[PDB]
Amino acid sequence: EDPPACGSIVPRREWRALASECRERLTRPVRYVVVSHTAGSHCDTPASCAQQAQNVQSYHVRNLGWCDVGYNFLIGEDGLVYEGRGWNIKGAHAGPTWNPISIGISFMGNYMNRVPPPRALRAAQNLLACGVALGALRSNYEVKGHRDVQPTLSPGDRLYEIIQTWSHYRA
Amino acid sequence: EDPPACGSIVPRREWRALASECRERLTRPVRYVVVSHTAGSHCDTPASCAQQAQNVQSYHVRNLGWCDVGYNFLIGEDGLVYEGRGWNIKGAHAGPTWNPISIGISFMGNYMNRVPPPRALRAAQNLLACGVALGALRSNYEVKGHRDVQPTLSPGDRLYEIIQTWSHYRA
Amino acid sequence: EDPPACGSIVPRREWRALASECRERLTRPVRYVVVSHTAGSHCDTPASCAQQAQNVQSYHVRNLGWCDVGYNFLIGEDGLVYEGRGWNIKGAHAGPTWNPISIGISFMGNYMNRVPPPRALRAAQNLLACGVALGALRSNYEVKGHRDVQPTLSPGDRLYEIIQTWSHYRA
Amino acid sequence: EDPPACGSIVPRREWRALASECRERLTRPVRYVVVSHTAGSHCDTPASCAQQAQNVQSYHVRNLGWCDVGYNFLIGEDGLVYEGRGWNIKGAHAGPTWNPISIGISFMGNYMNRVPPPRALRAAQNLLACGVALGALRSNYEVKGHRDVQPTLSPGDRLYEIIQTWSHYRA
Numbered sequence: 001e002d003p004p005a006c007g008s009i010v011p012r013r014e015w016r017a018l019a020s021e022c023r024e025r026l027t028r029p030v031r032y033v034v035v036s037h038t039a040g041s042h043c044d045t046p047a048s049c050a051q052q053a054q055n056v057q058s059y060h061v062r063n064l065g066w067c068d069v070g071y072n073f074l075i076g077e078d079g080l081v082y083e084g085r086g087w088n089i090k091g092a093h094a095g096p097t098w099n100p101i102s103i104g105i106s107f108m109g110n111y112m113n114r115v116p117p118p119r120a121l122r123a124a125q126n127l128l129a130c131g132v133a134l135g136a137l138r139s140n141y142e143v144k145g146h147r148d149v150q151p152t153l154s155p156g157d158r159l160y161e162i163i164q165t166w167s168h169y170r171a
Numbered sequence: 172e173d174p175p176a177c178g179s180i181v182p183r184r185e186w187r188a189l190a191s192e193c194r195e196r197l198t199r200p201v202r203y204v205v206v207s208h209t210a211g212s213h214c215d216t217p218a219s220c221a222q223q224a225q226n227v228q229s230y231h232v233r234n235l236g237w238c239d240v241g242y243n244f245l246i247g248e249d250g251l252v253y254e255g256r257g258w259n260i261k262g263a264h265a266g267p268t269w270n271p272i273s274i275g276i277s278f279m280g281n282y283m284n285r286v287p288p289p290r291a292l293r294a295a296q297n298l299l300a301c302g303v304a305l306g307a308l309r310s311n312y313e314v315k316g317h318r319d320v321q322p323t324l325s326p327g328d329r330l331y332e333i334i335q336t337w338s339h340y341r342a
Numbered sequence: 343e344d345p346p347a348c349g350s351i352v353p354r355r356e357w358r359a360l361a362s363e364c365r366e367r368l369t370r371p372v373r374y375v376v377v378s379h380t381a382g383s384h385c386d387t388p389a390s391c392a393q394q395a396q397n398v399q400s401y402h403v404r405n406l407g408w409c410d411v412g413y414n415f416l417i418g419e420d421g422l423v424y425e426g427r428g429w430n431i432k433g434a435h436a437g438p439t440w441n442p443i444s445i446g447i448s449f450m451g452n453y454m455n456r457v458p459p460p461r462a463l464r465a466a467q468n469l470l471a472c473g474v475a476l477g478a479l480r481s482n483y484e485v486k487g488h489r490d491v492q493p494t495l496s497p498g499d500r501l502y503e504i505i506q507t508w509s510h511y512r513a
Numbered sequence: 514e515d516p517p518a519c520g521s522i523v524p525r526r527e528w529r530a531l532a533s534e535c536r537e538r539l540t541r542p543v544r545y546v547v548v549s550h551t552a553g554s555h556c557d558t559p560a561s562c563a564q565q566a567q568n569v570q571s572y573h574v575r576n577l578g579w580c581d582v583g584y585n586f587l588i589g590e591d592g593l594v595y596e597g598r599g600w601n602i603k604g605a606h607a608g609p610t611w612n613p614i615s616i617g618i619s620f621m622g623n624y625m626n627r628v629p630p631p632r633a634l635r636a637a638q639n640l641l642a643c644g645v646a647l648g649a650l651r652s653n654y655e656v657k658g659h660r661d662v663q664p665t666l667s668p669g670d671r672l673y674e675i676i677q678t679w680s681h682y683r684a
């Protein structure tokens with residue numbers, strides 16, 4: 001079980017993740033959440049999203065040489081959250097000024113001119129509520145979009161419009 | 172206004188349910204939770220799952236002429252929870268004696284000699300955790316099998332065998 | 343054919359009991375009776391005792407979040423028996439091992455340094471003869487003190503001292 | 514690397530315990546702590562508290578037929594902590610709802626109108642800092658008085674008043 005009402009994260013072992021080798025810790029009460037998109041293939045069933053999670057981590061580990069998938073959590077259009085590096089290990093997703101002070105969540109797919117289903121938007125807001133409840137996220141946490149932090153099109157134009165609608169979105 | 176720590180649920184509108192004709196209430200803090208299986212087809216994608224939700228509601232409303240789907244919540248093997256009568260409305264799932272005082276959640280499928288996948292079990296447990304967060308369920312709620320309350324094989328041997336290991340299961 | 347001498351019992355509705363939420367039945371005939379004391383204050387009138395009964399129910403139901411007062415019957419210093427969960431419903435008075443196979447009667451007060459008057463003692467024994475008549479108790483039932491079954495000072499040094507002299511007492 | 518910033522606990526062997534026969538385990542980190550008192554006499558020297566611990570134990574084991582002494586740890590007024598079932602094994606101290614999700618620390622003695630001496634409160638508080646340091650307790654663990662989760666006068670009026678002042682006490 002997980003501490004408080006904390007919404008159905010699919011664990012690493014369930015999507016067949018390679019073992020992590022990342023060691024850097026994340027200071028517990030984190031303030032920021034940077035939302036990005038993978039720019040990869042999109043996904044809408046648990047079978048196909050688990051495979052997509054394997055494909056992303058694979059690229060990050062086998063090819064780029066990283067210690068594990070770059071993001072802290074991945075989200076599928078199947079409307080489920082996939083455990084990446086987690087709440088405790090510093091992720092590699094928004095650059096050296098932002099990786100140690102934020103949580104990186106990534107929507108699997110390319111949302112430049114595609115919008116994610118409400119069930120995926122629901123899963124993320126629910127993952128974020130679990131964040132607070134847990135202590136990993138500061139109650140007054142701010143959500144930034146990848147592009148407000150690094151020069152890039154991520155999280156896609158259409159995904160980007162939505163996150164401004166968000167209660168916690170700053171700047 | 173605000174707000175749901177709680178968890179993520181596929182709402183009535185999203186799986187295209189007919190409107191509820193129900194108006195009888197469940198007194199605010201609920202004590203018992205009854206677990207059953209639908210004994211119908213199983214499901215593993217948001218698409219097919221939403222379809223089953225309708226087939227089940229359809230059968231309840233059109234054929235048995237109930238005011239709405241009999242369960243408060245339905246669980247899919249796609250790992251999602253589908254909204255039924257919900258937290259406030261009394262359901263029709265376990266007899267005139269247990270319906271006024273419990274929440275009936277049902278797994279879509281027949282678990283007589285088949286087991287539900289980990290993500291479905293995780294969705295159900297998460298759903299209940301959300302229940303006490305809302306104050307809909309007692310912190311000390313009690314889970315019961317459908318067979319413990321009325322003569323039926325529901326929730327199916329394999330699933331019944333599993334829920335007995337649940338922290339809140341009571342004789 | 344016709345009736346036994348049972349009813350010197352003050353019914354729930356007479357002492358203003360809150361509605362019960364318990365549903366687990368006892369299998370009759372019951373073999374054991376476990377004697378305890380509330381460790382609280384006493385009462386020697388039907389007036390104050392109906393009060394006392396209400397307060398210990400309020401504790402069990404409001405503070406502890408229990409379906410009902412934990413004892414099957416409560417005995418007054420006024421010589422009257424007060425209905426608790428009664429003969430057919432499992433109480434919550436001596437733990438998971440003993441609750442399903444026994445009836446828990448409790449003397450309202452603290453008998454560590456007081457003996458309960460004869461009329462309280464009389465009330466209790468006549469309650470027992472009764473149980474046998476109705477068929478609720480085995481004719482050869484055994485009485486155990488609360489401290490013989492759980493670590494507590496209940497039923498009180500003096501009353502404990504009193505019950506070990508009883509015909510039906512055992513180990 | 515040098516166990517462990519933790520505290521000074523008197524092990525079973527040292528107080529001559531009977532071999533535990535307890536097999537059920539707790540899931541670390543534990544979230545709850547229930548403070549109780551033994552309701553017996555106190556002890557104020559390593560010599561006497563060690564024998565008091567055996568007294569408490571033989572009662573739970575010989576008289577009550579339990580696998581081992583019911584508490585996870587016992588606090589003496591000699592200012593020392595006696596190893597009970599410890600951090601990993603499920604205790605038998607507050608019913609089936611709390612035994613599997615809490616650690617039971619018992620103060621040897623009756624505290625209805627006796628306060629424990631500073632060095633006993635200090636030992637209890639130290640033992641808890643210990644439990645967090647080892648990951649046996651959640652850093653935000655909650656403390657509960659015995660009488661807050663079950664019907665008893667435990668931990669005694671005076672001790673009850675003290676613990677309610679604690680940084681970790683919750684309703």
Ligand SMILES: CC(=O)N[C@@H]1[C@@H](O)[C@H](O)[C@@H](CO)O[C@H]1O
Nearest residue numbers: 408409432433434437438441442
């Ligand atoms: C055998 C047993 O433990 N029985 C339970 C008790 O634990 C519970 O707290 C109480 C109140 O709802 O109902 C009793 O039947």
